[PDB]
Design a protein around this nucleic acid. Structure first.
Length: 173
RNA sequence: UUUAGAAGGAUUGCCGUCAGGAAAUUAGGUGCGCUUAGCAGUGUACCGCCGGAGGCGG
């Protein structure tokens, strides 16, 4: 489907990850919440070696050649331009590896509270947190702040093989 | 197709008593260490929700 490719300009001091997290996410999520129809996000350079990176490059994907123009890409990112360039041609294509959202247990105290009142009252838990968190953590992230809960959380990512489907507000499957 | 082919070494035991190492000394003059440099995988993994382990929202 149609797509608009996003560079971060390289060799500027700041890392890709920081620039991607702070700039691109907030404005894309605000635009995504606004224009309700679920768009999609793909990273053309995922390269999991022992841990997993995210690359210089991201792709916004959608299935309407005018919906991308309804997002007004190159005029929204008009402050931080020195670190981001937004190409302006919504070219269709049929090659991509879509991504999803992996989750990660939660700290022992926050599980406990639910773990007691919910019932199922009173070391087996700690093994579950340690194993489940240790397995996942070695993937990529995109630190996220909050508008409501006003909290800091990290949204991990991982590939999949669906090649079509229905997406979410942040951008994954 | 090998100087081929073969093989049970084994039982037992009290090393002991005594003793002065000791007197003398000069290690000494010299000395060029010295050019360069960006520390981090995002600096962390937060509240809840289903639900008898496995999931999903922000």
């Amino acid at each position: 489907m149609f797509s608009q490719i996003l560079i971060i300009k390289p060799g500027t001091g700041i890392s890709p990850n920081i620039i991607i997290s702070e700039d691109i996410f907030p404005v894309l999520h605000s635009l995504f919440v606004e224009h309700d129809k679920k768009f999609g996000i793909t990273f053309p350079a995922y390269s999991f070696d022992k841990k997993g990176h995210l690359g210089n490059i991201i792709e916004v994907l959608s299935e309407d050649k005018e919906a991308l123009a309804s997002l007004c890409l190159e005029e929204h990112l008009a402050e931080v331009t020195d670190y981001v360039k937004v190409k302006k041609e919504i070219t269709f294509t049929d090659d991509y590896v879509l991504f999803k959202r992996i989750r990660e247990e939660n700290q022992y105290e926050t599980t406990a509270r639910r773990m007691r009142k919910r019932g199922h009252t009173e070391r087996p838990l700690e093994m579950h947190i340690k194993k489940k968190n240790q397995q996942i953590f070695c993937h990529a992230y995109i630190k996220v702040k909050s508008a409501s809960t006003g909290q800091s959380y990290n949204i991990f990512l991982a590939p999949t093989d669906i090649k079509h489907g229905s997406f979410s507000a942040y951008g994954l499957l």
